[PDB]
């Protein structure tokens, strides 16, 4: 069925399923629609014979150069997507709710790529975008398919971040702290401003645009201090670097960062160490450091993130598209 966002009780059940699901994703939580307040929310779900929710999908509709909308369920749906018969059922509900207004329904779940899975999806009528598309550009995928994920369940005895790494890396992580760097965290307006100052500075230094502060304020208003947390690194009164991490489902996700120009005393390493500590203290299964463009020392994102994740980067299935309007799809989507 389709979720009535005006029914507190219905909404409560939807959230309770999302928050308790091992497949939960913050970008599938109802709070995400509040962050993306410029998009239109349309959410659906399936129930079992007991009337209990077994699958859900939070979609957001965006405008395009055409009379059709772009329906996107970021990192959804919430369920075991390899169970394609169930997926088809959930999708059919989504399709019904979209009511012909969208030219496509796209979802990019965090499930490993495999020829077997890719083939099944294609056999079921879906159009997939992964190893067959451009690694970048407006034709690339919305979310990076390659991601540096730290699997903490491999270290059941880990008490502190250092316990996860070899001596050489322990050295790199100890450096900033040994040099006076200190990190405090929370989710207050004060910490958001601190983040914003480093965020805009880093953006200017990199010649890129930055999201407005209101974006993060909506995020702060949507998620409590146990879900969203900002880490601020400083040295003797000098703001150095920051990072924003979200804890949801089976992982804590390093989503945004900022760092001042000049000498930063490896403050970014300190931020990472504290985010990882938060994962450990909360018994979280995974710490996700985000995407990379390529697994090579030529990728600076890979270089930084490889310090904390020595395992191979995870490669997801990519974008799964349920083509609704063929003509428009071919116009707006190409390899
Ligand atoms: Mg623990």
Swiss-Prot record:
| Reactions the enzyme catalyzes | UDP-N-acetyl-alpha-D-muramoyl-L-alanyl-gamma-D-glutamyl-L-lysyl-D-alanyl-D-alanine + L-alanyl-tRNA(Ala) = UDP-N-acetyl-alpha-D-muramoyl-L-alanyl-gamma-D-glutamyl-N(6)-(L-alanyl)-L-lysyl-D-alanyl-D-alanine + tRNA(Ala) + H(+)
State how changing residue 318 to S affects the protein, per the record: Reduces activity 8-fold
Identify the Pfam families for this entry. FemAB
User: How sensitive is activity to pH?
Assistant: Optimum pH is 7.0-8.0.
What top-level class of enzyme does the UniProt entry assign? transferase
| Recorded consequence of changing residue 315 to Q | Reduces activity 3-fold
Source organism (scientific name)? Weissella viridescens
Q: At what residues does the UniProt record annotate the site feature described as Important for catalytic activity?
A: 108, 319
Q: Which PANTHER family match?
A: LIPID II:GLYCINE GLYCYLTRANSFERASE
Question: What, per the annotation, is the impact of changing residue 70 to L?
Answer: Reduces activity 2-fold
Q: What is the effect of changing residue 305 to A?
A: Loss of activity
Name listed for the protein in its UniProt record: UDP-N-acetylmuramoylpentapeptide-lysine N(6)-alanyltransferase
Cleavable signal peptide:
none
GO biological process terms, alphabetically, are: cell wall organization; peptidoglycan biosynthetic process; regulation of cell shape
Q: What is the effect of changing residue 103 to F?
A: No effect on activity
Instruction: Give the family from UniProt.
Output: Belongs to the FemABX family.
- UniProt effect for mutating residue 215 to L: Loss of activity
Q: What is its biological role?
A: Involved in the synthesis of the bacterial cell wall. Catalyzes the addition of alanine into the interchain peptide bridge of peptidoglycan precursor using aminoacyl-tRNA(Ala) as amino acid donor. This alanine is added to the epsilon-amino group of the L-lysine of the peptidoglycan UDP-N-acetyl-alpha-D-muramoyl-L-alanyl-D-glutamyl-L-lysyl-D-alanyl-D-alanine, in a ribosome-independent mechanism. Specific for UDP-N-acetyl-muramoyl-pentapeptide. Has no activity toward UDP-N-acetyl-muramoyl-tetrapeptide or UDP-N-acetyl-muramoyl-tripeptide. Also acts on L-seryl-tRNA(Ser).
Annotated residues that bind substrate are located at 36-39, 103, 211, 215, 256
Upon changing residue 304 to L, the result is: Reduces activity 33-fold
What result is annotated for mutating residue 204 to Q? No effect on activity
- What are this entry's molecular-function GO terms? UDP-N-acetylmuramoylpentapeptide-lysine N6-alanyltransferase activity
Known EC number: 2.3.2.10
User: Consequence of mutating residue 291 to V?
Assistant: Loss of activity
Which InterPro entries does the entry mention? Acyl_CoA_acyltransferase (IPR016181), FEMABX (IPR003447), PG_Glycine_Bridge_Synth (IPR050644)
Q: What is the effect of changing residue 214 to Q?
A: No effect on activity
